[PDB]
């Protein structure tokens, strides 16, 4: 959709888009105008000479206060383009990465960043065409030969930055085999990155070579291997990029799920006759040695995007800021709604902001220091917070994956709260997750007392059918059966009777 900011962009856009179609002709006319005079002089060679020149000069007069004004307004819209509207995008990319409501789609405002340079670049052409006449006819007082240097200059300025902006990291870093585990990388791992020029210029195909580096205290610094270069080109939406397949990384030798790195892309640009400093970099990385630190740093990434939205700062947990439960929340539901087609309701989010918070009412202003969110263990548990919901995913993800696809899942809900469940009839059931299992487990539940066995880890989902058989032989020496009714109400086969062979 189009914000109405947008409205005013694209707006904006077409205004300078005009006044360039109005420089082209006003330009067009005085040259005219100005082959007369020199036709005039040369023939000559009275007065439709001392006065075609009086006239000559209040063209000159025009045309360049015309341009100082274009340019004026050149300043203002790339503003509204690059510090506004792709400062925008970059955050939305930010949180995209951490399973954020995506949409980050380059083409918007590769039109916008496009079609503003065409202009800039015909507005550059126009000021050369005026140092044409600086050159054909000229006079003391020549208002060309003493603000051309000058739009030339400032213009000039306009697109060095404007190109350097278009340069950006359309899909960050990541390997190609942990695709939800992006600005984490394993050293002896093969990732793909890529860049993009959002400067679409068909003359600029395959002239660029994009370099990528990495790193240039006391850190572990590293180095990419594999083919270290790639060449910008207009391949698949014939956009300018670069991809870089097959990278892998190593460490430059003779905490670290805390420690971030950020990689470098470069390449000069030549154009119209310029050179172009152009270079951009990818949302810092943690770079771990085992798939074991997996986790624990991808919660340093979710941590810092989550927060500040600064892409060069590795110094982030130099002192890690806070984070009222909101946000934390609403990123934790996040994480399901990527992978799955659900997240988490404020209901499974409480019995959790609660079992990390503990008592009370309200979790909102609530501060979550770093530490308390994974940097420290449960209450009585033998390990932390994240670590322990790592797997809950993972298991949701890889097992009870479109078993968790209609809810069915209670998933969080207090032992406690659990027993309001004490109403339905005896025999319908929960499905939670052990509380007390690191390696994720999912169990169920069921005076008619309440009970609930003993979880069941990923090993053992090596569940549809543990739903269909568990008899849990009884007192009187019967081998009772599986007791029916999700909590709803739903007898187990309209729910779990599909998926079974």
Known sequence: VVTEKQQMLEQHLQDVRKRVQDLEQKMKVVENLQDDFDFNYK????????????ALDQMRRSIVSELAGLLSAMEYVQKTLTDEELADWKRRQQIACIGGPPNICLDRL????????????????????????????????????????????????????????????????????????????????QFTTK????????????????????????????????????????????????EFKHLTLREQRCIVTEELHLITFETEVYHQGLKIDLETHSLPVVVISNICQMPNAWASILWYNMLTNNPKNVNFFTKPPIGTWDQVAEVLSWQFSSTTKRGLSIEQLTTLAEKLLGPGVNYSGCQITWAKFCKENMAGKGFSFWVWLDNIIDLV????????????????????????????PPGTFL???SESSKEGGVTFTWKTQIQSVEPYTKQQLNFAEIIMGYKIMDATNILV?????????????????????
């Open 43 to 54: 023939t000559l060679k009275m007065q439709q000479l001392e006065q075609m020149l009086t």
């Open 110 to 189: 590769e039109n916008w960043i496009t079609s503003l340079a065409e202009s800039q670049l015909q507005t550059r052409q126009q000021i050369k065409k005026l140092e044409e006449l600086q050159q054909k006819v000229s006079y003391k007082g020549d208002p060309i030969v003493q603000h051309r240097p000058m739009l030339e200059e400032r213009i000039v300025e306009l697109f060095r930055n404007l190109m350097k902006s278009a340069f950006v990291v359309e899909r960050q870093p990541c390997m190609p085999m942990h695709p939800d585990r992006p600005l984490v990388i394993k050293t002896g791992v």
């Open 195 to 242: 860049v993009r020029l959002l400067v679409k210029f068909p003359e600029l195909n395959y002239q660029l070579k994009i370099k990528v580096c990495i790193d240039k205290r006391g850190s572990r610094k590293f180095n990419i291997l594999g083919t270290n270069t790639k060449v910008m080109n207009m391949e698949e939406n014939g956009s300018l990029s670069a």
């Open 397 to 424: 993800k890889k097992y009870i994956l479109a078993l968790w696809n209609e809810g069915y899942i209670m998933g969080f809900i207090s032992k406690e709260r659990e027993r309001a469940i004490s109403t339905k």
């Open 431 to 433: 499905l939670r997750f």
């Open 481 to 501: 059966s599986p007791l029916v009714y999700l909590y709803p109400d739903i007898p187990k086969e309209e729910a779990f009777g599909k998926y079974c062979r």
